[PDB]
Amino acid sequence: EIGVKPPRGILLYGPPGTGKTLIARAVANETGAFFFLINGPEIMSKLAGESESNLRKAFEEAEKNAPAIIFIDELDAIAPKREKTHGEVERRIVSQLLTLMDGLKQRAHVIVMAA
Amino acid sequence: PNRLIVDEAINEDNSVVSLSQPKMDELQLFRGDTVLLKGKKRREAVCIVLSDDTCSDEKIRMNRVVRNNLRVRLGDVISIQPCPDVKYGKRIHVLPIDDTVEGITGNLFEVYLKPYFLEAYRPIRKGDIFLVRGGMRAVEFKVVETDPSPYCIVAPDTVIHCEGEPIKREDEEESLNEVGYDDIGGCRKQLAQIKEMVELPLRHPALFKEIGVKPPRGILLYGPPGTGKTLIARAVANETGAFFFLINGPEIMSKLAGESESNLRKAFEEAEKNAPAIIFIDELDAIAPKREKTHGEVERRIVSQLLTLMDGLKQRAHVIVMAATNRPNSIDPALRRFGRFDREVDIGIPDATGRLEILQIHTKNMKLADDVDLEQVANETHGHVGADLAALCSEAALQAIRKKMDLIDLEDETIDAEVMNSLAVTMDDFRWALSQSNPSALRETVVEVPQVTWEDIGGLEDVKRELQELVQYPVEHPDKFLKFGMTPSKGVLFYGPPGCGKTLLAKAIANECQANFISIKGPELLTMWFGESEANVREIFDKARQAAPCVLFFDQLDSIAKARGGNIGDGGGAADRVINQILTEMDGMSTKKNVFIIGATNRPDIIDPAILRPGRLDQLIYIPLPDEKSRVAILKANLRKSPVAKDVDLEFLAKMTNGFSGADLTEICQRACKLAIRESIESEIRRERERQPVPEIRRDHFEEAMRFARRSVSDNDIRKYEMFAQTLQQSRGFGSFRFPS
Ligand SMILES: Nc1ncnc2c1ncn2[C@@H]1O[C@H](COP(=O)(O)OP(=O)(O)OP(=O)(O)O)[C@@H](O)[C@H]1O
Ligand SMILES: Nc1ncnc2c1ncn2[C@@H]1O[C@H](COP(=O)(O)OP(=O)(O)O)[C@@H](O)[C@H]1O
Ligand SMILES: Nc1ncnc2c1ncn2[C@@H]1O[C@H](COP(=O)(O)OP(=O)(O)O)[C@@H](O)[C@H]1O
Ligand SMILES: [Mg+2]
């Protein structure tokens, strides 16, 4: 009705153990729209190149099964500060995540949540 | 004459234009001919030209479909030219829009294309979108192949096939939402320069060949973050139809030896492969610092690679390399050479009209009420940058949303249409968003607003007028000073006994006046380091110079400014060296920007006279102890909000309070009200005690109040301030200036 931009990026931050994963599971159990969860350790465990494919496939499936709830638990694993980082694979994953974040055209009805 | 104002059609379908017959004679265009139209972002249209008796000479009548094709709206300007040599079509490929054929399972060809193309000889182009009625819902099509290309006349023999993959709504929405020259506000002159460097050689290279010069291939953009450098780059790249390649400084940088060089080489290889291209290197400052300044060899290696790449790039390629930086002085001077971004284009903080344009751009899609006024928001956002303005609009939308949550039920999926239509952006929403938004030009100098207004300040009417005039006359009336050919005054110093309103007169300007306010505590700028204390002075003035018109306020200026050379204990001359840095900033060899310097000092005699000369702090205003009339105004101003008993005679208090300062009167008001708090608290407690009053402060509260009050400034102290103001009078040409005869 008002033609505005919904906030696609939601960032939950705080001391650990507070229940961000608890909120993640609560959202997953109780959202009618499609849900798919990705973890920082899970992405980093995968070899070079396949993590690229995993992230792209996850986002593609999310926008395919619209609406979608994209959750990245332990985001700092996959997006360490570019000012202080060494791994080029991590740099490329940061660039890929940035591009995919900018990719949404808002007709995908896909929300991205970070803990 | 070719340029035409876009006008509404009356009976015209997708392939006819209705124009004035006199212009048909002027342009030598005959009825029934096929005509070529070009619009914004490189869109071409072929139409059968017709004449109309009701069309204005400068206007062209067209329907919605072609305007949507031509990406032009009513009031825009389009080009009209003959389109000869258009042959009949052999085989044309059409493809429908995905959202127009949802649920349609009929034969697209027979139902839609045949009635539309039956014996009509409609001209078409590759990429055209035309709307055809019929069936159960009007169907749009996208023309993807034309034989011949890109123009053909659809003859009856033209084999028309519509099979294939329907076009997604993604490309259609991108075409409308692709950035362009319209999405830029507040940078018209810089945009014109960039047009001259980029668009003109592409449009008319014949002029450059005639004069035999090669236009520069590099444009350097510098300004505060978010001012629109990347947006300008993308807009100029999209309008020229050049492949926009974006490079960020951090992601090029790598720990491995030579990897950043390889990244730059590969990027330039991709740009030279995909031509025309416009390389954009954001954060150029971090990637390419000064080779002699840096000690890490990788930075100098990156700079040398960039030099060799941009030098070998100029092989008559169609690639233009532009970069954005916050501070151009950090960039290596080897880059500033001929070529290698040989021209620098400056993007600044948006002005009032510029930010008004930016708000109009960012609210064109948004629904707005009739109560909301855009010029108001343009005024109130004093130092906001365009990105901040877009965030402001979004935050106001979410403001309306959080207002209207309580009406809508999140549980049910059903939506009410009237509740939906009620939703619109209101002025209150912009006010909230502005209250919870920051100016990025001043985000570093952030401070709370104590909310002081000119009506709050009691007395000082002559001094109040001068502050209004000095801050307002240049910015509000710039042509008037040009008419008289003299620059305005930009310096004020307040000296007086403590508590008389020196800080109030500055806290009023921070709110009322529409000028940026950067606030400085006295010893704030000083640093224990050798070269930082003077550097802090430089950066604070640079911040104020950037966000002009700005009011720079030096509270307790006596600490910063001393008569110089007083003693060797001043940090080994560091204190006296800070003076010299301030002296050049106020009055040095730089163009006088709209930076108004105000200083509030208690003791002015210690101030360096080089500060107090005209041109730095030219107007010295003495704020005395309030007089009988002034003390009345202070009392009324303080008790304006508080409920006061009618039997209180505020004029009587001012008569007995002979020498009390301004803060002394405010203490009495606070003390008088403080006792009234004590009385109401006890009476309320007594009511609780008995079970198991004073709506306005009475005159009885005042009588016990004054006996606690006292005079902050002694008689001897006033004499010192009184002595100083007398010297200024003695310095002037004696006697009231009387012109002879
Ligand atoms: N003319 C006045 N009208 C109204 N209130 C005043 C006036 N003068 C002083 N006050 C009151 O004095 C208090 C603070 O005074 P203020 O900060 O303006 O003093 P100042 O002259 O700048 O002193 P200092 O030299 O100590 O910094 C406030 O409560 C303010 O309302
Ligand atoms: N209010 C709560 N109710 C139930 N469980 C909680 C609550 N707060 C925390 N937890 C528990 O703490 C864990 C949350 O850890 P979390 O902070 O998500 O780890 P990390 O932040 O390191 O990923 C969950 O397993 C959850 O069971
Ligand atoms: N002159 C302008 N007109 C319209 N929008 C602008 C303008 N300047 C900046 N913006 C907004 O700022 C955002 C982009 O910020 P940008 O200027 O690209 O960052 P930076 O210059 O720091 O790289 C865009 O959303 C754009 O709408
Ligand atoms: Mg003060």
The reply to whether B508 and B375 lie within a common domain is no
CA distance A51 to B75: 51
A74 lines ligand 2 (CB under 6 A): yes
CA B226 to chain centroid, in Å, comes to: 9
User: Considering every ligand atom, which ligand is closest to the CA of B555?
Assistant: 4
CA distance B393 to B670: 41
Structure tokens at B225: 């973050």
CA distance B558 to B608: 9
SS3 B348: coil
Structure tokens at B61: 């009548």
Interface contact flag, B421 A5, Cβ < 8 Å: no
Q: Does A64 touch chain B (CB under 8 A)?
A: no
Phi and psi angles of residue B143, each rounded to the nearest 5 degrees, phi first: -85, 120
Mutate to test the pocket of ligand 1, among B661, B666, B712 (most ligand atoms within 8 A of CB): B666
Strands B4-8 and A110-114: unpaired
The reply to whether B680 and B698 lie within a common domain is yes
* Resolution (Å units): 3.6
Domain-embedded: residue B257: yes
Among A2, A94, A105, beta carbon nearest to B366:
A2
The reply to whether B167 and B152 lie within a common domain is yes
B433 lines ligand 1 (CB under 6 A): no
Q: Residue B215 gets which letter from DSSP?
A: P
Structure tokens at B573: 């001359």
SS3 A64: helix
User: Considering every ligand atom, which ligand is closest to the CA of A72?
Assistant: 2
Domain-embedded: residue B738: no
- Rounded to the nearest 5 degrees, what angle is found at the Cα of B288, between the Cα atoms of B284 and B290? 125
Domain-embedded: residue B448: no
Report yes or no: B57 and B39 within 8 Å, Cβ to Cβ.
no
Strand pairing partners for B47?
B35
Interface contact flag, A4 B393, Cβ < 8 Å: yes
On whether B499 is known to bind a ligand per the annotation, the reply is: yes
Q: Does B364 touch chain A (CB under 8 A)?
A: no
Q: What's the structural domain count of chain B?
A: 6
Residue nearest to atom 13 of ligand 1 (CA): B663
Q: Which atom of ligand 3 is nearest to the CA of B357?
A: 3
Question: Distance from the CA of B306 to the center of ligand 3, in angstroms?
Answer: 26
Domain-embedded: residue B430: yes
B225 lines ligand 3 (CB under 6 A): yes
The reply to whether B317 and B386 lie within a common domain is no
Question: Distance from the CA of B336 to the center of ligand 4, in angstroms?
Answer: 46
The reply to whether B599 and B645 lie within a common domain is no
Interface contact flag, A2 B397, Cβ < 8 Å: yes
CA-based nearest distance B175→chain A, Å: 12
With 0-12 / 13-18 / 19 or more C-beta atoms within 10 angstroms meaning exposed / middle / buried, residue B259 is middle
The reply to whether B418 and B500 lie within a common domain is no
Among B170, B251, B400, beta carbon nearest to A2:
B400
Name the experimental technique.
Answer: cryo-EM
Structure tokens at B533: 């204390």
Q: B607: closest CA among B548, B564, B647? A: B564
Domain-embedded: residue B318: yes
Q: Does A107 touch chain B (CB under 8 A)?
A: yes
The reply to whether B499 and B574 lie within a common domain is yes
CA distance B77 to B59: 9
CATH code for the domain of B2: 2.40.40.20
Interface contact flag, A105 B250, Cβ < 8 Å: no
Residue numbers in the known binding site of A are 16-22
The reply to whether B478 and B617 lie within a common domain is yes
- Strand (E) or helix (H) holding B45: strand B43-51
Interface contact flag, A4 B366, Cβ < 8 Å: yes
Report yes or no: B171 and B140 within 8 Å, Cβ to Cβ.
no
Please, which residues have CB within 8 angstroms of residue B17's CB and are 6 or more apart in sequence?
B35, B37, B47, B48, B49, B50, B60, B61, B62
The reply to whether B261 and B131 lie within a common domain is no
Q: Does A84 touch chain B (CB under 8 A)?
A: no
CATH code for the domain of B681: 6.10.20.150
Query: Given B418, B442, B466, which residue is the final one in a domain?
Result: B442
Question: Distance from the CA of B502 to the center of ligand 4, in angstroms?
Answer: 6
Domain-embedded: residue B727: no
Mutate to test the pocket of ligand 2, among A11, A12, A18 (most ligand atoms within 8 A of CB): A18
Distance linking the first and last C-alpha atoms of chain B:
65
CA distance B603 to B496: 8
CATH code for the domain of B152: 3.10.330.10
Beta strands in B223-314 (DSSP E): 243-248, 277-282
A41 lines ligand 2 (CB under 6 A): no
Q: Cα separations (Å) of B184 from B231, B261, B362, B392, B397?
A: 8, 34, 10, 17, 22
SS3 B371: coil
The reply to whether B618 and B478 lie within a common domain is yes
The reply to whether B464 and B607 lie within a common domain is yes
Q: Does B174 touch chain A (CB under 8 A)?
A: yes
Domain-embedded: residue B723: no
CATH code for the domain of A36: 3.40.50.300
Q: Does B251 touch chain A (CB under 8 A)?
A: yes
CA distance B224 to B235: 19
Q: Is the peptide bond before A67 cis (omega within 30 degrees of 0)?
A: yes
CA distance B233 to B181: 10
Instruction: Transcribe B554-607 into DSSP letters.
Output: EETHHHH---S-S-TTTTTTHHHHHHHHHHHHHSSSS---SEEEEEEES--TTS
Domain extent for B33:
1-82
Query: Given B176, B201, B236, which residue is the final one in a domain?
Result: B176
CA distance A82 to A90: 9
The reply to whether B169 and B186 lie within a common domain is no
Q: Is the peptide bond before B439 cis (omega within 30 degrees of 0)?
A: no
CA distance B5 to B20: 12
Q: Cα separations (Å) of B447 from B430, B480, B507, B510?
A: 21, 34, 11, 11
Domain-embedded: residue B300: yes
Q: Please report residues of B whose CB lies closer than 8 A to that of A5.
A: 394
Interface contact flag, A2 B423, Cβ < 8 Å: yes
User: Considering every ligand atom, which ligand is closest to the CA of A75?
Assistant: 2
Structure tokens at B172: 């259609």
Report yes or no: B44 and B69 within 8 Å, Cβ to Cβ.
no
Query: Given B312, B328, B346, which residue is the final one in a domain?
Result: B346
Strands B123-125 and B151-153: antiparallel
Q: How many residues does chain A have?
A: 115
With 0-12 / 13-18 / 19 or more C-beta atoms within 10 angstroms meaning exposed / middle / buried, residue B246 is middle
For residue B275, the tally of other CB atoms under 10 A from its CB is 11
Instruction: Transcribe B94-129 into DSSP letters.
Output: EEEBGGGSTT--S-HIIIIIHHHHTT---EEETT-E
